[PDB]
Amino acid sequence: NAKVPAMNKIRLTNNWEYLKGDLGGIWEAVRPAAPGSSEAVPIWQPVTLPHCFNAEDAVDPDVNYYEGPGWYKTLLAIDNPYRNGRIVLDFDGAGQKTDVYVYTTHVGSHVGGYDSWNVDITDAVKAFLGSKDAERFKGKVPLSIRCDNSRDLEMIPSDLADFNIYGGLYRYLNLVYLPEVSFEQIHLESSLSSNLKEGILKVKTSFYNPEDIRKADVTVSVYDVDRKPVFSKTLEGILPLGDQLLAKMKIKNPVLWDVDVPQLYTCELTVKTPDQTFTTEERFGFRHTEFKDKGPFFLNGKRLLLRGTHRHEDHAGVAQAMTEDMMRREMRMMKDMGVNFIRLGHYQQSEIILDLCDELGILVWEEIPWCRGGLGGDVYKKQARRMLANMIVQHHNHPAVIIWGLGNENDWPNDFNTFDKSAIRAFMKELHDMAHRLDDTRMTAIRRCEFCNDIVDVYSPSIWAGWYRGVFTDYKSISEQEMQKVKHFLHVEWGGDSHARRHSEDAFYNLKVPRASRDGDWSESYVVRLIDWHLKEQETMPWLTGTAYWPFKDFSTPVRPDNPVPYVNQKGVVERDFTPKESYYVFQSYWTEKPMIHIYGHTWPVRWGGKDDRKEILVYSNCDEVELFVNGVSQGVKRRNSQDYPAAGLRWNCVYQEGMNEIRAVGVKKKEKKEVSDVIRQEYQTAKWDKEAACQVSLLSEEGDTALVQVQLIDKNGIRCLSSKKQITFEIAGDGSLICNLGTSTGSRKVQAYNGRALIRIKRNEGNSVVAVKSEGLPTAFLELKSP
Amino acid sequence: NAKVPAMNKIRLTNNWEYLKGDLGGIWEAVRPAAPGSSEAVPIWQPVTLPHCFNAEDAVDPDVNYYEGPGWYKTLLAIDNPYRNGRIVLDFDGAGQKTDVYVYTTHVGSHVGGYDSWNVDITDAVKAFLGSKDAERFKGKVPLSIRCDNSRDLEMIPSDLADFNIYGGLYRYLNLVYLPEVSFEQIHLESSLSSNLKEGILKVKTSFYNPEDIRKADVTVSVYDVDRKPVFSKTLEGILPLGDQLLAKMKIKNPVLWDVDVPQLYTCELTVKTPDQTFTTEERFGFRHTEFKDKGPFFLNGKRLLLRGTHRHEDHAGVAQAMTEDMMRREMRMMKDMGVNFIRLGHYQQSEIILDLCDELGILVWEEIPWCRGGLGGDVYKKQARRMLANMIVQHHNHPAVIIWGLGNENDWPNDFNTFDKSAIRAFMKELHDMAHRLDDTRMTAIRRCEFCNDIVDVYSPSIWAGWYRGVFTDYKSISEQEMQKVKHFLHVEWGGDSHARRHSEDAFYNLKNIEGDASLYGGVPRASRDGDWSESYVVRLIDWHLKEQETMPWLTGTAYWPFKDFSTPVRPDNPVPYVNQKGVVERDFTPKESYYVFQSYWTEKPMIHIYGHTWPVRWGGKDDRKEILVYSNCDEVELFVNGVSQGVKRRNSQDYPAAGLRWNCVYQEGMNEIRAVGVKKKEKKEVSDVIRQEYQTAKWDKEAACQVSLLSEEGDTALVQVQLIDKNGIRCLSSKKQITFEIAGDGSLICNLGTSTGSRKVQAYNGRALIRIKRNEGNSVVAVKSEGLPTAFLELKSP
Amino acid sequence: RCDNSRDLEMIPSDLADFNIYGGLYRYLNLVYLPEVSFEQIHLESSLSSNLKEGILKVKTSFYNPEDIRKADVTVSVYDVDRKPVFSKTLEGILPLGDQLLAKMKIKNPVLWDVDVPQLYTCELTVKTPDQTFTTEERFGFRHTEFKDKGPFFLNGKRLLLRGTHR
Numbered sequence A: 001n002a003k004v005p006a007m008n009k010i011r012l013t014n015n016w017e018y019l020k021g022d023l024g025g026i027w028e029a030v031r032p033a034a035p036g037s038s039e040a041v042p043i044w045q046p047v048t049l050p051h052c053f054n055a056e057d058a059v060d061p062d063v064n065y066y067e068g069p070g071w072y073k074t075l076l077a078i079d080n081p082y083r084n085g086r087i088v089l090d091f092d093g094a095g096q097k098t099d100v101y102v103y104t105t106h107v108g109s110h111v112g113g114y115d116s117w118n119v120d121i122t123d124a125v126k127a128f129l130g131s132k133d134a135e136r137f138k139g140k141v142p143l144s145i146r147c148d149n150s151r152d153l154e155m156i157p158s159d160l161a162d163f164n165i166y167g168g169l170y171r172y173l174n175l176v177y178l179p180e181v182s183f184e185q186i187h188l189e190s191s192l193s194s195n196l197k198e199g200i201l202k203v204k205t206s207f208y209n210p211e212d213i214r215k216a217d218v219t220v221s222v223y224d225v226d227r228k229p230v231f232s233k234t235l236e237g238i239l240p241l242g243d244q245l246l247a248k249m250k251i252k253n254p255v256l257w258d259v260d261v262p263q264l265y266t267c268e269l270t271v272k273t274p275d276q277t278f279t280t281e282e283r284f285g286f287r288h289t290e291f292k293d294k295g296p297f298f299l300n301g302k303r304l305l306l307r308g309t310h311r312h313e314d315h316a317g318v319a320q321a322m323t324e325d326m327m328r329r330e331m332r333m334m335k336d337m338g339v340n341f342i343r344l345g346h347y348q349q350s351e352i353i354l355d356l357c358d359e360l361g362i363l364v365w366e367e368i369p370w371c372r373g374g375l376g377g378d379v380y381k382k383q384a385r386r387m388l389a390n391m392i393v394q395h396h397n398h399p400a401v402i403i404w405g406l407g408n409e410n411d412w413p414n415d416f417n418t419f420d421k422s423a424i425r426a427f428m429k430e431l432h433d434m435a436h437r438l439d440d441t442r443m444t445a446i447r448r449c450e451f452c453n454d455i456v457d458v459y460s461p462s463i464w465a466g467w468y469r470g471v472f473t474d475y476k477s478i479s480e481q482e483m484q485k486v487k488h489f490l491h492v493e494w495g496g497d498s499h500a501r502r503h504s505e506d507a508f509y510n511l512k513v514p515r516a517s518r519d520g521d522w523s524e525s526y527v528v529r530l531i532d533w534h535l536k537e538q539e540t541m542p543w544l545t546g547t548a549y550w551p552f553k554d555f556s557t558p559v560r561p562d563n564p565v566p567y568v569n570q571k572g573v574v575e576r577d578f579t580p581k582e583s584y585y586v587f588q589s590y591w592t593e594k595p596m597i598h599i600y601g602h603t604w605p606v607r608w609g610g611k612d613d614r615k616e617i618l619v620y621s622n623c624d625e626v627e628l629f630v631n632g633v634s635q636g637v638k639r640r641n642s643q644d645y646p647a648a649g650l651r652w653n654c655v656y657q658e659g660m661n662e663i664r665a666v667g668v669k670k671k672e673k674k675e676v677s678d679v680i681r682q683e684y685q686t687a688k689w690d691k692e693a694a695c696q697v698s699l700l701s702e703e704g705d706t707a708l709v710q711v712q713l714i715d716k717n718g719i720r721c722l723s724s725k726k727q728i729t730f731e732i733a734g735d736g737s738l739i740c741n742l743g744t745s746t747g748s749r750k751v752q753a754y755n756g757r758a759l760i761r762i763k764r765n766e767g768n769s770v771v772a773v774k775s776e777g778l779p780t781a782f783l784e785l786k787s788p
Numbered sequence B: 001n002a003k004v005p006a007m008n009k010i011r012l013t014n015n016w017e018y019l020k021g022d023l024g025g026i027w028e029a030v031r032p033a034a035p036g037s038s039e040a041v042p043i044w045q046p047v048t049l050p051h052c053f054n055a056e057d058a059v060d061p062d063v064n065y066y067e068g069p070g071w072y073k074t075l076l077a078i079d080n081p082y083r084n085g086r087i088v089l090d091f092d093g094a095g096q097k098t099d100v101y102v103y104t105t106h107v108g109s110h111v112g113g114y115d116s117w118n119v120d121i122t123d124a125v126k127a128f129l130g131s132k133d134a135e136r137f138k139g140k141v142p143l144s145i146r147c148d149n150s151r152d153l154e155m156i157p158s159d160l161a162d163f164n165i166y167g168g169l170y171r172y173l174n175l176v177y178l179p180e181v182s183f184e185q186i187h188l189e190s191s192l193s194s195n196l197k198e199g200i201l202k203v204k205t206s207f208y209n210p211e212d213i214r215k216a217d218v219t220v221s222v223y224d225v226d227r228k229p230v231f232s233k234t235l236e237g238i239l240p241l242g243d244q245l246l247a248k249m250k251i252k253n254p255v256l257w258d259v260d261v262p263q264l265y266t267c268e269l270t271v272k273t274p275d276q277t278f279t280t281e282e283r284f285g286f287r288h289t290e291f292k293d294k295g296p297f298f299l300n301g302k303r304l305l306l307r308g309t310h311r312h313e314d315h316a317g318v319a320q321a322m323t324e325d326m327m328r329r330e331m332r333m334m335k336d337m338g339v340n341f342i343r344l345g346h347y348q349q350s351e352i353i354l355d356l357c358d359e360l361g362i363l364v365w366e367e368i369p370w371c372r373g374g375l376g377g378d379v380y381k382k383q384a385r386r387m388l389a390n391m392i393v394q395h396h397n398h399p400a401v402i403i404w405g406l407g408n409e410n411d412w413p414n415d416f417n418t419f420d421k422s423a424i425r426a427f428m429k430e431l432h433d434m435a436h437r438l439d440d441t442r443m444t445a446i447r448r449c450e451f452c453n454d455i456v457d458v459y460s461p462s463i464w465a466g467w468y469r470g471v472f473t474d475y476k477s478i479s480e481q482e483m484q485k486v487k488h489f490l491h492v493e494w495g496g497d498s499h500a501r502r503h504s505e506d507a508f509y510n511l512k513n514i515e516g517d518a519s520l521y522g523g524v525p526r527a528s529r530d531g532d533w534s535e536s537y538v539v540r541l542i543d544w545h546l547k548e549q550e551t552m553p554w555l556t557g558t559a560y561w562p563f564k565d566f567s568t569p570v571r572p573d574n575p576v577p578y579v580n581q582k583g584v585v586e587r588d589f590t591p592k593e594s595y596y597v598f599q600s601y602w603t604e605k606p607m608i609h610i611y612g613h614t615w616p617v618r619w620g621g622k623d624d625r626k627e628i629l630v631y632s633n634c635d636e637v638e639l640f641v642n643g644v645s646q647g648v649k650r651r652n653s654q655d656y657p658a659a660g661l662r663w664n665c666v667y668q669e670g671m672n673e674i675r676a677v678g679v680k681k682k683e684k685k686e687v688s689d690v691i692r693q694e695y696q697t698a699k700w701d702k703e704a705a706c707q708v709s710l711l712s713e714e715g716d717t718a719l720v721q722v723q724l725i726d727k728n729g730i731r732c733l734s735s736k737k738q739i740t741f742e743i744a745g746d747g748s749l750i751c752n753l754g755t756s757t758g759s760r761k762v763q764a765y766n767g768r769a770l771i772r773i774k775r776n777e778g779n780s781v782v783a784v785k786s787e788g789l790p791t792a793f794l795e796l797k798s799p
Numbered sequence C: 001r002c003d004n005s006r007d008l009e010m011i012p013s014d015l016a017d018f019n020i021y022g023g024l025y026r027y028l029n030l031v032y033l034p035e036v037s038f039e040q041i042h043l044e045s046s047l048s049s050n051l052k053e054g055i056l057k058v059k060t061s062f063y064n065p066e067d068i069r070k071a072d073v074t075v076s077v078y079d080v081d082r083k084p085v086f087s088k089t090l091e092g093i094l095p096l097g098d099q100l101l102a103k104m105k106i107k108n109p110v111l112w113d114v115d116v117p118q119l120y121t122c123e124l125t126v127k128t129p130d131q132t133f134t135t136e137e138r139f140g141f142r143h144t145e146f147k148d149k150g151p152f153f154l155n156g157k158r159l160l161l162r163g164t165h166r
C-alpha cells in the first residue's frame, strides 16, 4: 500500500452520514427509500470527516467503548480533469478493517488502522454512471464504506494494550484524480559522508500505468532549501512501467537537516506524454546519525542528548479524529517545550505528523502495533509484516525518522492459551531482517522484551523510577546497569500520573523530606519533582543516548475505568485538550533558551498548614537568577543551578498570611539581556477540616451561553476538605447540557475531586436547567442555572 | 426438543453475565484475569435469564435498537444423576444466530430466532474436566454463548418487518440431564371417524441412543381427561434406535377437544434397561376440523366463528424475554376476552404459549418468519425450509394448531435489487408441498400475497376497513368480495391504533342545543381513520366489525391485530415512540377501552363497562347531551348520571353502536358520576360499573405552559402529572404535543416501558402526560420540556 | 468428464469384488420437452386382503420453469390388453410442484405374477394453449408377504424364490 504521491488531493470532509452498527447488505445503503417507510430506519447521523466512532464513549465513565462495525455514505460529484484519467480514493488511515463500495460493487478492503492505502475506483465509477441506476442518483456516485474495530485476537494491536483500538474514518479520506501515467511510489534515498561534505541522492520510482503507455518523458529536478535548482535532468522516451531508477547524484557541501535548523531539499518529478503533464514533489534531508557502542547518540557528528516524548493519536472531543490544525498546534507545543525526539506511540501515525517533525526538527522512532499478548497465526503475522513494510516504504523519505520499532512489551502474555518465547524470537528476527532489507540506513528497536534484546539494533527496557519501581532517585543507577546489557541503549517511557489541578502540601519541603516513591495521591506536585530529578541527572550522563517521557498529552485508554479521570492515562504533562500542566514548565525550563519563568501553583487556589509555617515555593525557570516576592516583600535573589535540587536552586520557604496571598517572581537571563516575570494568587487556609459532609455547589463564572460550575467538598462546619479525592458525579435536567466526556479533570461528569473541588462547564442553550451533584455517602446538592 | 423430558430439566436463570458486543476470540471468555488487569475490561453486566439485548433500547426514543453480537457466560455445576448419562443444553429460543462454547471448544450453532434446538455437550464436558485447565475453575465448567441479531438480508425475517428482530437468550435455556436411552421425538398422530365416535392414535418415536444400547423395554400408556388409563402396553426387547412405531390404538367414544371445554389425553412413555427407568409425558387431543369451500369453519361438526387475535413475543421492560408467569397472565387475559383463535405473530412461539392454547381452548395459526422483502439465495431458502420443518415437527402434537403459515406480505419488495414473482411462487409451492408431506392433517396459509393465492389451502388478503382503506362500514362488503376469490378465506389482521388514555369528543355523537323550544344538532363522526388515534375511534371500529360478523354466516372468522401493544423499529414517530399501538391491551397488560368491546360481544360471564375509565375530563357546551357508551353483555342496562336515571335500554348487537346501550346526557360543570347497572337473565345476575368524570365548558387557546405536579405517591414511587394549559390557565384538552421528561438527582424515571405512562418522550393525551419516578428515598428535580414552551421544573424530596 | 478415480470417501469400496467402472456406460439421451412436463410420476398401488380390490394413487411432480399458472391434465389407466379402466381430466389445475392426480379403486384387478407378469399402464397428458404432451408409466398389482420365521408368499400363494445375481 502507498499514500499516493499526488498534487491534487480533495479532502472529502462534508456531506457524510454515519451509522453505528452493521447493514444487512450493501443493498441497504443504496436501495430506494421513501420517508416514513421501513427503509427509513435505522436513522443515520450527519457528520464531517475525519470521524471516530469513539469521540465520546472512550471516556464516558459508564460504558465500554464501542468495538464493532459502522458505516459511512456520501454521494460523489465526479469530474475528472484528465483525459482518460483515474479516480482514486486515498486513505490517510481508517480503523481497523475497512471495506469500500461504489453503489453495490465491492471495490477494495484493508486491514490495519494506522497505515495509508488507496483504491482505484475508475472502472466501478464508469460502469455505474453508464448504468440504469445512475439516474435516480442525479448524476452522483454513491460511496459507502464499512469500518470495523471489533475485538480480534488475530489482529494487531492487542486489546491488552493501554490505548483505545479506535474505529472509523478518523484520518482524512482523499479523492485523487490522476492522469493516465503517474507515480505509485517515490523513494528519495540519500546518504551523507562521515565528514558531512558529500551527499548522495538516488531517485527511484514505481509507475502507475494501467493503460500500458509505452513511452514518456520524465524530468527530475532537485531544489535546495532556498528553492534554487541544484540538478535537473529529463529522460526522453523512458518506459513508464513498474520500477525505474531516475537519477543518481552527488551533492557537495549539502545543506544539512538538524534539530535546531531543519533544512529540506525538494525533489520535483514530471511525467509528460502527448496527453498529460503531471508533476509532484517529495522532500528529503541530508543528515548523519550514529549510535555509539555502549555510548551516546550523534547527529551530524555532534553528541545530541535525545530530549523525547511520546504521543497518541487522541484528543478531547474527537478521539483519533484530529484535524491538521490540531496536529500543528500539538507539535508546535512540543517544540516550544524543547522536545527534539518523539516515539509516535505504538503505531504509524498520520503523514501530517511526520511532515511536522521534518519541519520542526524532531527525530522520530515509529513502530508497528505489535503491542502485547504474544503471537498469533498466519493472518496475524502477515499483518505485522505488511504494516512494517507499509510503514518503512511510506515514511522512508522523512529525515526525522531514525528508528523503525518492531513492537512493544512483547513479553506480555495471554491473548492466546500458549506463550512461546522461541516463536516470538523467530518472528522478531524475521521482522528485523525484513526492515534491514527494506531500509538499511535506519536502526530497528523494541521496548521491553528482554528475551529479544539481542535481536534489534536499539533496545529499551522498562525504567519507571519513582512510579512503578523504587524511588526516582534510583534513576541514574538503574539506567547505568541497564545500558551495560545491550549494544545501543535508548530509554523510552518514564514519568508518573498526575490528576491535573490536584496539588499536595506533603509533596513539598515545608518548614514547621518528601518521599521519592509513587505518590499514591497522583498530585502534580509529585510528578513535578520526579521530572525535575530525571532532567537534573541527565546532565551528568554523557554516555546516554537519551530518553522519551511517556506521554506528552493525556490520552484515553480502555483499561483504566477507575482513574481520577476515568478511562484517561494521566501521565501527560499536557491535558487532553492541550492545557499545559505544571510539569510542562519543568521540561521547558530545562530544555529551552527563550526566557521563561513559572511559579508552581497556577492551578493551586488554596494552600494549607499551620500559622507561620514556612511554605516551600518552587519556580521553574531558565533564567540565570530569580527574585521572589511574597505579598510585595522580597524573599531574596537566587541563582539557577540544575544540580541544586529541586527547582535548580530557585526555591524559597516563605510564610503565607491567612487568606489571599500574591506571589511574584522576576527573572533575568543575561544571554538574552531579558527580564521576565510571573505572578500567582493563592489563598492560605489554617483551619483544619473534619470528614467530608456536603457538597457546596456554586456558579463560578459565565462566558456567553456557558456557565462554569464549581463544587467544593466541606466538612460538617463548612471548612474546605482540601485533601479530598472523592468522586463527584454531575447530572443535569432542563435546557442545558453538561460539557463532559472530554477526558479532562474539568470536562468529566464523573471525576475525582482535586483538593476537594471539581469544575464543569454547562452549555445553557439560552434556557433554564438544574444541575445535581452527587458524592458517595453525602447529600445530593443542587444548583439552578438560568439564562439572561 | 420439548416437551420430551420434565424434571431433570433445570432452567438456567441465575449467575449469568452479559456483554453487549463481541469478544476477540473464545479465549477472552475463559482466560485468567486479575482485578485491575487489561483482562478485567470490557466490563460485563450481571443478568438473569431469560434476557433480551433490547429490553430497553427497542422503545428508547433516541437510539436505533441494537442489532449485533452479544455474549453470555456462566459456570455450570455439573452432577449428572444418571449412570453414564448425557448433558444437553436445550434452547426454547434465542435470537438470531447463536454459537455455544464449552471452555474453548465450539460445540454447536443455530440460525433462527424462533425455533427450539439443543446441543449434547457430554463429550466436551468430559474432555474439559479431564484436562489440566479444569483445575482453576474449581470443578465447574465454563459455558460461553454468543448470540447475534445483526441485520442480515439473507436471513428471515426481514428488517422491513413491523417488529423488532430481537437478540439474546430471550427464552428459557435448560440444562437437561438424560440417561443413556431417551426420546428425541414423540409424534402423537390422532384422527377421528366421520361420526366422531371413534378415535385413532398412533404413537411414533425417535430414540436418542448415543451409546448404542441394543434392547430396551418401552411402555406406552394413555390416560383420559380424568387421568384414567385407557391403554397400556409394554414392548419387551425393542430396538431403541432411530424411529419406532410404538402403538396404534382405537379409542371409542373419545372425549373431544373444544374451544369451550379443552380436554386432553396424556400419553406416557417409559424406557427401561438394567441401568435406567426414564418416563416422560406428551399430551394430545381429539378434534375434527373442516373448512367449507366458499364457506365457514367447522370444529367437531359444528360451525364455529373464529374469534381471533394476534400476539408478539414482546412485553414492557423485557422485550422478548417474557417469563412463564407473564405468558400465563397474557393468555388468561385473552381467554377472559372471549378469544378462541390466535395467529402467533410472524414466527414460531414459545412452547409455553402452545401449551396455554391447548389448555385454554384457543385454536392456533403459526407461521415461519418469511415476512416481507422478496426472496434470497440458498442459505435463505434453507433457513425457511428448516424453520418450517422444525415448527411442524416440534408443535405437531398440539390439538390447538389448525394452520401452518408459510409467510406474510411476500409481495413486499426491496430487500434485494430484484423481485421475481415466479421464483417466489416456486419456493412458496415447495414450502406448501413440504408442509403437507410433514403433516397432511392441517391446512397451510399465507397472508397478503395475491399472486400466490392459488398455492395455499387458506388465504387471507389485506382488509383494514376504517384504518388503511376506506371506511369501516365497507367491512362486510369488502369481505364478501374477497372471500369469493379463493376456496378458503380467513381474515387475519384488522383494527386501528389508539394512544392509550387519549379520548376524543369528536369521535362521539354529541348533541348541541340550537335556539320557543330549542332543537338539537350533532355531527356524525366519520368512519375513516381518526388522525388523532383516539381510543374513542377504535372502540367504534371494533364494535362495527363484530356487529357485522353476526350477519356473515359464511365467514370462517377473523383475527384482530394485535392483542397487545408491541414495539416496532419502523415507527419512531408514534405517540408512544417505537410502539405499534393497535392493541386493545397496553404493553404492560393494562386493558384499553377496546378490550371491553370484544369482551361484551364474545363472553357470557356477566360484565358491564362504561366507556371512559381513563377519560378524566370531557368537554363541550353547558347543555350539550354527551354520548355515553356502555359495553356489556347484559340483556338490559340502566344508566344513572349524577344519581338521575336516564332510562333502561335493551341490548341488541345490530343497534349500533354499543348494541343499543348508548345514551345522550347532560353533564354538569365539574365532577360527574356515571353509574350503569345491568342484568343478565340467563345467569340471573346483576352487575354494575361507575366512573367519575369532570366536564369543562371553558374553551382553550394555544398551549402556553406545562403545569407539573405530584399527583400521588406509593411508597418510594411518585406519580408526576403534566398538564398543557393556555395563557389563561385553561387546560388544552385536545393537545397532542410531545412531552419530554428529564431528571437529575437521586431518583430515576420509570421509562422505556413502551406505554403512554412509562415513556420519557410521549405525545400528550388530552393535554396531559403521566410518568412515575423511583425516588430512591432521596431528592430529585424533574424537568418537563415541550417544543416552543418554557421548560417546567418539579422538585421531589423524601422524608 | 467422467472419473472413476479411487476414493475412500465414495461408495462402493475398492475392496469390493467388482470393478468400479468408468465412463458413459449407459445410454445418454437428448430429451426435448414442452414448457410444462412431469418431473416424477409415482404410481402407488395396493391390493386388498382377498386380492379382489386394488387401490392406485397417481402422484406427480411438475417441471414448470416458465411458471405457467394453469393446465389441463388427463389421467388414464389401461389394462393388460390396453383397455381403459379409468380416465379423468382435471381442468385448470396448477402445474407446479406436487399434485395428487387421482385415487381409484379397481375391482378384481389382474395380478402380476412370476408365471404371468401383467402390467397396467398409466397415461398422463398436460395440455395448455401451446402444448400437448403425453407420457406413460407402468405398474402392477400384487401382494407380497414374508412370514415370521417362515417362507415367502406372492398373491397369497407360497412362492420359493429361485434366484440369481448379475
Ligand code: PRO
Residues within 6 Å of the ligand: B188, B189, B190, B191, B283, B284, B285, B286, B287, B396, B397, B398, B399, B400, B441
Ligand atoms: O395428529 C393430530 O392432529 C392430533 C391433534 C392433537 C394431538 N394430535
Ligand SMILES: [K+]
Residues within 6 Å of the ligand: A057, A058, A059, A060, A061, A062, A063, A064, A065, A567
Ligand atoms: K469508556
Ligand SMILES: [K+]
Residues within 6 Å of the ligand: B057, B058, B059, B060, B061, B062, B063, B064, B065, B578
Ligand atoms: K428505539
Ligand code: NA
Residues within 6 Å of the ligand: A151, A152, A153, A154, A155, A156, A157, A158, A159, B024
Ligand atoms: Na487485537
Ligand code: NA
Residues within 6 Å of the ligand: A024, B151, B152, B153, B154, B155, B156, B157, B158, B159
Ligand atoms: Na433479515
Ligand code: NA
Residues within 6 Å of the ligand: C006, C007, C008, C009, C010, C011, C012, C013, C014
Ligand atoms: Na470408494
